[PDB]
Write a protein that holds these residues in place. Structure first.
Motif: not given
Ligand SMILES: [Cu+2]
Length: 166
Positions: A73, A98, A136-138
């Motif tokens: 990320t 996501n 940063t949610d991936r």
């Protein structure tokens, strides 16, 4: 005409320059630079090929069909190579959300835009380097969709890119 060379696009990986890391990619084996369609063409299940004749094999979608580049990320450097430079309107980047389903046809409604860079109606160099941020949610397998919008035509070049985020 152009493709994303790094991280290698799905089409690019079908070529010898891309290591033949994807097999059975139709026209992408020889001309990954040629995925040209009108701007704002986002047909579900036809994102990777942009609906272009001869690029249909790119549209297959499973969790394991395509080679992924391992990335993290945060900042990601994108490098395009242009075999034919054209006056440029825009560069847009999208990534799957996501929770997306890697065994279903690609649908732009399941992506967020994550970058947009104005081409200022100038002619880029043959190698174009940009930096985008991967949210940063991936985690895990995602698809980045990179779109080069031509300044003096109604068309764009479309590059689906398979990544594994860890
Ligand atoms: Cu061209």
């Amino acid at each position: 005409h152009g493709y994303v060379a790094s991280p290698g696009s799905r089409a690019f990986f079908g070529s010898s320059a891309g290591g033949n890391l994807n097999t059975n990619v139709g026209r992408a084996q020889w001309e990954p630079q040629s995925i040209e369609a009108p701007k704002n063409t986002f047909i579900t299940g036809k994102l990777a090929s942009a609906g272009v004749s001869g690029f249909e094999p790119l549209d297959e979608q499973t969790a394991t069909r395509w080679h992924k580049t391992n990335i993290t990320t945060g900042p990601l450097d994108i490098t395009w190579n242009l075999t034919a430079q054209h006056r440029t309107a825009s560069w847009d980047y999208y990534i799957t959300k996501n929770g997306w389903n890697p065994n279903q046809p690609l649908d732009i409604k399941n992506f967020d835009k994550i970058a947009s860079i104005d081409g200022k109606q100038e002619v880029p160099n043959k190698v174009v380097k940009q930096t985008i941020n991967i949210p940063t949610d991936r985690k895990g397998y995602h698809v980045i969709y990179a779109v080069w919008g031509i300044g003096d035509t109604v068309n764009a070049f479309y590059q689906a890119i398979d990544v594994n985020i860890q």
